[PDB]
Design a binder for this molecule. Structure first.
Ligand SMILES: *[C@@H]1O[C@H](CO)[C@@H](O[C@@H]2O[C@H](CO)[C@@H](O[C@@H]3O[C@H](CO[C@H]4O[C@H](CO)[C@@H](O)[C@H](O)[C@@H]4O)[C@@H](O)[C@H](O[C@H]4O[C@H](CO)[C@@H](O)[C@H](O)[C@@H]4O)[C@@H]3O)[C@H](O)[C@H]2NC(C)=O)[C@H](O)[C@H]1NC(C)=O
Ligand SMILES: *[C@@H]1O[C@H](CO)[C@@H](O[C@@H]2O[C@H](CO)[C@@H](O[C@@H]3O[C@H](CO[C@H]4O[C@H](CO)[C@@H](O)[C@H](O)[C@@H]4O)[C@@H](O)[C@H](O[C@H]4O[C@H](CO)[C@@H](O)[C@H](O)[C@@H]4O)[C@@H]3O)[C@H](O)[C@H]2NC(C)=O)[C@H](O)[C@H]1NC(C)=O
Ligand SMILES: *[C@@H]1O[C@H](CO)[C@@H](O[C@@H]2O[C@H](CO)[C@@H](O[C@@H]3O[C@H](CO[C@H]4O[C@H](CO)[C@@H](O)[C@H](O)[C@@H]4O)[C@@H](O)[C@H](O[C@H]4O[C@H](CO)[C@@H](O)[C@H](O)[C@@H]4O)[C@@H]3O)[C@H](O)[C@H]2NC(C)=O)[C@H](O)[C@H]1NC(C)=O
Ligand SMILES: CC(=O)N[C@@H]1[C@@H](OC2O[C@@H](C)[C@@H](O)[C@@H](O)[C@@H]2O)[C@H](O[C@@H]2O[C@H](CO)[C@H](O)[C@H](O[C@]3(C(=O)O)C[C@H](O)[C@@H](NC(C)=O)[C@H]([C@H](O)[C@H](O)CO)O3)[C@H]2O)[C@@H](COS(=O)(=O)O)O[C@H]1O
Ligand SMILES: CC(=O)N[C@@H]1[C@@H](OC2O[C@@H](C)[C@@H](O)[C@@H](O)[C@@H]2O)[C@H](O[C@@H]2O[C@H](CO)[C@H](O)[C@H](O[C@]3(C(=O)O)C[C@H](O)[C@@H](NC(C)=O)[C@H]([C@H](O)[C@H](O)CO)O3)[C@H]2O)[C@@H](COS(=O)(=O)O)O[C@H]1O
Ligand SMILES: CC(=O)N[C@@H]1[C@@H](OC2O[C@@H](C)[C@@H](O)[C@@H](O)[C@@H]2O)[C@H](O[C@@H]2O[C@H](CO)[C@H](O)[C@H](O[C@]3(C(=O)O)C[C@H](O)[C@@H](NC(C)=O)[C@H]([C@H](O)[C@H](O)CO)O3)[C@H]2O)[C@@H](COS(=O)(=O)O)O[C@H]1O
Ligand SMILES: *[C@@H]1O[C@H](CO)[C@@H](O[C@@H]2O[C@H](CO)[C@@H](O[C@@H]3O[C@H](CO)[C@@H](O)[C@H](O)[C@@H]3O)[C@H](O)[C@H]2NC(C)=O)[C@H](O)[C@H]1NC(C)=O
Ligand SMILES: *[C@@H]1O[C@H](CO)[C@@H](O[C@@H]2O[C@H](CO)[C@@H](O)[C@H](O)[C@H]2NC(C)=O)[C@H](O)[C@H]1NC(C)=O
Ligand SMILES: *[C@@H]1O[C@H](CO)[C@@H](O[C@@H]2O[C@H](CO)[C@@H](O)[C@H](O)[C@H]2NC(C)=O)[C@H](O)[C@H]1NC(C)=O
Ligand SMILES: *[C@@H]1O[C@H](CO)[C@@H](O[C@@H]2O[C@H](CO)[C@@H](O)[C@H](O)[C@H]2NC(C)=O)[C@H](O)[C@H]1NC(C)=O
Ligand SMILES: *[C@@H]1O[C@H](CO)[C@@H](O[C@@H]2O[C@H](CO)[C@@H](O)[C@H](O)[C@H]2NC(C)=O)[C@H](O)[C@H]1NC(C)=O
Ligand SMILES: *[C@@H]1O[C@H](CO)[C@@H](O[C@H]2O[C@H](CO)[C@@H](O)[C@H](O)[C@H]2NC(C)=O)[C@H](O)[C@H]1NC(C)=O
Ligand SMILES: *[C@@H]1O[C@H](CO)[C@@H](O)[C@H](O)[C@H]1NC(C)=O
Lengths: 174, 319, 319, 174, 319, 175
């Protein structure tokens, strides 16, 4: 939507990921590999579960009301009984259309956000030692085995340790 | 290598669904949810709510004591169902403000009657007619008592009935309009009748209008029904010099969840918390488009028959 | 220069409009659009809907057959316009529950009238008065039939008229209240009269009420009007020993898009799909502040007169 | 808005651009020049077009309703007819007030986003070869003629090609 | 050092309140504000509006002229307060459409009577009853005038009263219902009675209703009230040959801010601009949960009793 | 937290920040220090002030209305007077529940924006003379005293001044 992440700088989704909603695809010293991030998957799901309950009260019992269908033509009171009923339906229909419209709007941007946040979160870990390719994808200027990629997802990636290595690979150009 | 390439992304599905946002009319997302019930169960479900199948009887008939409504004599309900092939089979009558009496009875949630000891000295009781027939013999509304003269005089009736209970009693009674004047005098001596039903707080007097009307079940005369609510501590008083269709007792008027609904849809062993003329409907969805007429824990009626709420992200298959 | 500066920017305009957001009370944008309709056209527009100028006639005088409404006998409409300075020029009258009859007729969208062969034996018909004038001569309501005695006897009338059509027939009828006992006995032999308009399903008795009223077009008497709907398969029976103002036939009701509306605005050759008592208005805005009274494809009436919707980004001028 | 691009880090708008809503301004070896990105402009235009249609239904036919003005005092029934009418108009008045506000709030935030989306799109394209100056304005570190700028607007730039050239110019300091 | 570091952040507090958003049901924020008024002031407040205290009187009793309601005789109001312990103490009555007449008078904002010179020749006036006591002995409603026979007769009354003022007058009058046929002739000779009140535009005739009723203050007679509105230019007329209870004048009718409210809460010295049966409520919150009955500048009544609006950012205390 | 500023890369808020909502803490060649940013604090409060008055109107004086409590059972008119009010109250209850939700959703992410905007604003000043530590925090690669720190807050920070010093301190490393 608005962050330009989903359907934006990320070309497309990954149908081959049933693990979760957001995740990683890393190519490294040990072939390739895919993973999921269950903090970002959970953070979106939590906001979408019970999304409608924060607005619509749980259905309330209604019993004897007025009559809404008539066999006779009575004039004045039947006019009023009808007008009341239609006023209500028109108003609830608009409520229903607008609710759906902006609860959906929100669902789209909430999800799009979580992507951006994940990208940025992992970007801020790498710091000097990487590059944003524009695919929503990183080129790391050093050797990460799978326990290395592990660390970036757990959040325990020490960037100062690889910094020296990173620069020698980065700088060799003129 | 000396250079890993870590990539981020999100998931997609085989087939997603179009939804509507503020930004777009249509847009694909990974999973939606229908927010509006279109489909009904096909029949009215007898569980959760106590429902009474009115069959051939209307509600007012079932309480007046129509001879084909004797099954309902002792019954109460959460929702009374009036089939539209229903009829009346008794003495032809009308009710000034039928709509209200129906709604009042409907809300009361019962036609449970309570006999009171009325005394009608001077007059002959339990008048009958070829119109209402209990079995093969001439009969009359169960909850009403048709008083005509005894011997050769109809002396003014003046009969009181206190309410020492702590609830409001509801008395149904009526006045009888004969067809001709030869008939007016024959039944009740006086050439002109009257019934003055009164309490401390209110009172009503009705004058019988003599005249031919269309024939229903052989009868040109007719009967008009009226009710009177007698409060706790208050006191009923029926005074009349001809044409009175007297009460036999009273209905307990209840505050309740009870109602009445029109439907020709059948009834079935099945559980549900909504009822409509079309049949019982599912409760889970917040909105609904089956019928505006409803009873029970019912979702809101709207004019749109479909609305999609997204429960997933934007679905972007491979470009 | 061995370099190049590349700048991104948004556009701006030379007449920024102020709008309201959730964050700000008044914020400037590149373009707005009005949502509320403030002004009418000042004329009611007669292309699209078939609209009918009441002129000197009200909707009820038009169907009863007031002499100066003769021209409306065969009319039909989507909207009937009632001018406020309309009047009656016929026998002075009242209609109990007038608004209802007016609403019913308005919904019908016609005052077309089918005659019927009612036999009134032993009573003189087509009685006229000084208040209704056809040209110079005396007259009366054209859709009503004033029945007085013939010779020196006004027998009990008992006239039947079965409904063998497949639609609901409206019958308009009345009772006449004379000014004195001396007048009552002279027109209708009986000291006190009656009318009973009955059907299989319901009935309606009216006694008249002698006594002086204020003069209206030189008349102290009064007429009251009642209506009766005879469903198809049913039958209308009229029973009266004096004072009946009988019908000459029936109106046919048509469940339809028809209404009535009070307004003193002109009616021009013009196009619109919505009409208010201030004339036709434009149909394209979602909202409208002209009048709560409307008819047609018409926007929602709201209290506020202006609501500006942003149709562009934020306008930021050079500071 | 919330992205801080419009009336924020971009100082102001350009009346001299009638080619579009968003666009560029460049100065290089071949002098100055303006452009317009029709992709973004068309994205925002498309979201704003038929904006109100998506919530409020197409206007509907209303025929014989109740009476709303009275020439006579009646009480109970007239009380009710007026309360229905009052109730209805209060609710619609509310619904219009709210709609305008939040529809605009939305209209401001998606236009602001589409500015920032473009900024980030072009930033991610240049990688090492440029620098954000604060103004929403990049200083590129190489000889970029108009054919080269064209390749940035249309999205066919090549940062590997201009890299060696970019680094020499960039690092003439210590 | 050799270099420096700069750190950004937001503030936080100790007393974080939980609120609701679209993404979470509960979430801590720095400050929040209550939007629903739960607490009422526990007393109705005599400012800013003018309020009358019905005390022992109901509104209809005060405007008819019950002897124990003579203190209200000259009073107007912004809001009249009917206490539940209030009673009648004059002749037993009923009013068809009591609810309407209550509304019409409640809106007017006054019970201020204007007397007028009515002329009742041939009858005896100012009839009194033991039910309606003032000082010591018999009396009657002070705004009604009970007319009985003079000597051997009660001739037909025919009295006119034109409205040359520029405002709608409201006449209140009634009809008496004798206990027996013995009273009907004893008071108003004619075996039948009648009251025909009419203007140029409308009429009402009301027949008496002879019949025995329960006792209220020793009396089995009753009296019914009807009201009649006379417009500028129009003219009131009253015809009757018995049982009339005449008006003595007219109430001025007002387009006003006035109303009536049932409540048993004490009225106290204070200042407030919204009133409910529960007492005055504070004005400042946009919604309210005290009572759906409100008079004045009142927040909207809603079913929730608490809605916290966030007035601060998200609150993250140090974990 | 759609931007991930508040309750995201900023671990938590400062309970000892009395002056403003958003602000700075620093440490330099003169010890530690704290300051508030008034431009951002005012920016958020101006949106939260009268937030509700931009949607719901100046309460209007209502006078005589229908009756809403009855002491007498009387059928269809009463039943309608009940349905009219009961419809009204449900429609308003919904509006209130809806308004509060989305008006709170707005306040949360509006304040999150200011935090992110304040961050990117200072990040765009430092340019390549500093380093985002992921902490909502910077490592400036040059000696920046209290007058120099003010230069960042007030927005007049000339990065070209310290650019040479910035690179010496940054690059001292190969392997
Ligand atoms: C005022 O005016 C009305 C209308 O004229 C009168 O009411 C009519 O009264 C006549 C008798 O005078 C009625 O005629 C009789 O109808 C009976 C019912 O027939 C209908 O219903 C049967 C069901 O039983 C159906 O089969 C069918 O649809 C009929 O329409 C018949 O049973 C009677 O038949 C007997 O007599 C006739 C001879 O006339 C012969 O066929 C046999 O001998 C048979 O046994 C008879 O036809 C008429 O139905 C009434 N109509 C209405 C609308 O009420 C009032 O009497 C009149 N009042 C006055 C003058 O004071
Ligand atoms: C109960 O009480 C009421 C009210 O007192 C009586 O009704 C009044 O009755 C009298 C007598 O019949 C009416 O007086 C007559 O009115 C006629 C029309 O009124 C006009 O008044 C002026 C005329 O300038 C007009 O502006 C106005 O619009 C009316 O048109 C007049 O025509 C009569 O005057 C003379 O007219 C003819 C003309 O040819 C002369 O030849 C005669 O001499 C005649 O006198 C006269 O003014 C009065 O209008 C009635 N008022 C009302 C409100 O009804 C009831 O009669 C009474 N009932 C009883 C006692 O039983
Ligand atoms: C139609 O039928 C009704 C009901 O049967 C009759 O109305 C009753 O008539 C009787 C006799 O007239 C009334 O009784 C009289 O009224 C008072 C009784 O009420 C007092 O006491 C009771 C409790 O005992 C209280 O509830 C109430 O508040 C009163 O305080 C007494 O005042 C009368 O008694 C006095 O008079 C007698 C007669 O001489 C003396 O002997 C006594 O000493 C005493 O001083 C008397 O009891 C009764 O109240 C009426 N009931 C109702 C409901 O109205 C009609 O009379 C009847 N109509 C006919 C036949 O035409
Ligand atoms: C073929 C024929 O004409 N036979 C005569 C009968 O006349 C008629 O039949 C009735 C049903 C009706 O359709 C008439 O219009 C027709 O001419 C006559 O039958 C009697 O007629 C009277 C009045 O005309 C009543 O209809 C009466 O029926 C009851 C009834 O069931 O409603 C009897 C019932 O016990 C009685 N209720 C009472 C006293 O409380 C009612 C009541 O009076 C009326 O309903 C008034 O509201 O009337 C019916 O028996 C027969 C029998 O004559 S009898 O001497 O009156 O019994 O006579 C034939 O010649
Ligand atoms: C000064 C005086 O007394 N003049 C006598 C007339 O009395 C009156 O003048 C009329 C116009 C009116 O203003 C009266 O209030 C006043 O006393 C009288 O003229 C007539 O008055 C009678 C009633 O008293 C009628 O109004 C009658 O006219 C009609 C009418 O046009 O309305 C005639 C019409 O054919 C008739 N319709 C019928 C029978 O179907 C109606 C109808 O009876 C009433 O409207 C029912 O309420 O009345 C008019 O003639 C004449 C006496 O005329 S009479 O008819 O031969 O008795 O005498 C004057 O000296
Ligand atoms: C024990 C006994 O029978 N005593 C006789 C009285 O009868 C009754 O006692 C009175 C107090 C009352 O409770 C009655 O219900 C009881 O039968 C009788 O007293 C008269 O009774 C008549 C009813 O027939 C009235 O109640 C009358 O009182 C008033 C009243 O106060 O309301 C008098 C008042 O001036 C009068 N107003 C008028 C004419 O405008 C009203 C009015 O008639 C009724 O309210 C109309 O519905 O009645 C009361 O005095 C007396 C005989 O008195 S009478 O005047 O000859 O009737 O005799 C006792 O022995
Ligand atoms: C800023 O917005 C205003 C108001 O929305 C623009 O004026 C409107 O422009 C529309 C096209 O966007 C015009 O459409 C025309 O409508 C008629 C309907 O009868 C149709 O027949 C034509 O074919 C055409 O589609 C419309 O006339 C006009 N509306 C009003 C009230 O002025 C304005 O052009 C916009 N300005 C800028 C700089 O974008
Ligand atoms: C698509 O979403 C729908 C609606 O959210 C899912 O259906 C519900 O899922 C919830 C959450 O787990 C369950 O509690 C309910 O049992 C489901 N039923 C209903 C009626 O809402 C559904 O699981 C999703 N479908 C797929 C294929 O993933
Ligand atoms: C409703 O009424 C109809 C007709 O009166 C009933 O059908 C008759 O039922 C009886 C037994 O009750 C049988 O003797 C007849 O053979 C039936 N006749 C016809 C024409 O159907 C019907 O059963 C009634 N329905 C209910 C639910 O009681
Ligand atoms: C439920 O049943 C009702 C009858 O109670 C249906 O009502 C009909 O609806 C059609 C729709 O095209 C209309 O033509 C008429 O307004 C109705 N006709 C009659 C005779 O009542 C209704 O369609 C049913 N609804 C659903 C969702 O099945
Ligand atoms: C937190 O919110 C409360 C309640 O909204 C604020 O209290 C307001 O204080 C002013 C006095 O300056 C009063 O006039 C109002 O009655 C209060 N309510 C308002 C303005 O809506 C309070 O200012 C806030 N407290 C803090 C510490 O921010
Ligand atoms: C409706 O009412 C007025 C008043 O009755 C009619 O009267 C006028 O026009 C006539 C032309 O035929 C004149 O002869 C009248 O003197 C004149 N009166 C006034 C006060 O203007 C008018 O024609 C009627 N209009 C219609 C459409 O029938
Ligand atoms: C929190 O604490 C301060 C203490 O003075 C108080 O003024 C403020 O209103 C409190 N806010 C809430 C929401 O409790």
């Amino acid at each position: 939507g608005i962050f330009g992440a989903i359907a934006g700088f990320i070309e497309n989704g990954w149908e081959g990921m049933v693990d979760g909603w957001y995740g990683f695809r890393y190519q490294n010293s040990e072939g390739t590999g895919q993973a999921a991030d269950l903090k970002s998957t959970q953070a979106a799901i939590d906001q979408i579960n019970g999304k409608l309950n924060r607005v619509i009260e749980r259905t309330n019992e209604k019993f004897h009301q007025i009559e809404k269908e008539f066999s006779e033509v009575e004039g004045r009171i039947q006019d009023l009984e009808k007008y009341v009923e239609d006023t209500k339906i028109d108003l609830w229909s608009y409520n229903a259309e607008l609710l759906v419209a902006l609860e959906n709007q929100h669902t789209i941007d909430l999800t799009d956000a979580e992507m951006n946040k994940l990208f940025e979160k992992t970007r801020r870990q790498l710091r000097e030692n990487a590059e944003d390719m524009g695919d929503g994808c990183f080129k790391i200027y050093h050797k990460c085995d799978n326990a290395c990629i592990e660390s970036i997802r757990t959040g325990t990636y020490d960037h100062y340790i690889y910094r020296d290595e990173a620069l020698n690979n980065r700088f060799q150009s003129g | 290598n000396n250079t890993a390439t870590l990539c981020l992304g999100h998931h997609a599905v085989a087939n997603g669904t179009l939804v509507k946002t503020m930004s777009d009319d249509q847009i694909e997302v990974t999973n939606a949810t229908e927010l509006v019930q279109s489909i009904s169960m096909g029949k009215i479900c007898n569980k959760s709510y106590r429902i009474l199948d009115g069959r051939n009887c209307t509600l007012i008939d079932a309480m007046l004591g129509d001879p084909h409504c004797d099954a309902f004599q002792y019954e109460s309900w959460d929702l009374f169902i009036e089939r539209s092939n229903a009829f009346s089979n008794c003495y032809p009558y009308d009710i000034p403000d039928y709509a209200s009496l129906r709604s009042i009875v409907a809300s009361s949630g019962t036609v449970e009657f309570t006999a009171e000891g009325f005394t009608w000295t001077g007059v002959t009781q339990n008048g009958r007619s070829g119109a209402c027939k209990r079995g093969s013999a001439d009969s009359f509304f169960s909850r009403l008592n048709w008083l005509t003269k005894s011997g050769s005089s109809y002396p003014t009736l003046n009969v009181t009935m206190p309410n020492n209970k702590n609830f409001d009693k509801l008395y149904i009674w009526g006045i009888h309009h004969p067809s001709s004047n030869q008939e007016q005098t024959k039944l009740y001596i006086q050439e002109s009748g009257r019934v003055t039903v009164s309490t401390k707080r209110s009172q009503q007097t009705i004058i019988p209008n003599i005249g031919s009307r269309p024939l229903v079940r052989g009868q040109s005369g007719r009967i008009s029904i009226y009710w009177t609510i007698v409060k706790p501590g208050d006191i009923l008083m029926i005074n009349s010099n001809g044409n009175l269709v007297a009460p036999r007792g009273y209905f307990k008027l209840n505050t309740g969840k009870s109602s009445v609904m029109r439907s020709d849809v059948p009834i079935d062993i099945c559980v549900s918390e909504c009822i409509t003329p079309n049949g019982s409907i599912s409760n889970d969805k917040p909105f609904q488009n089956v019928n505006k007429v409803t009873y029970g824990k019912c979702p809101k009626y709207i004019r749109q028959n479909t609305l999609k709420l997204a429960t997933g992200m934007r679905n972007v298959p491979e470009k």
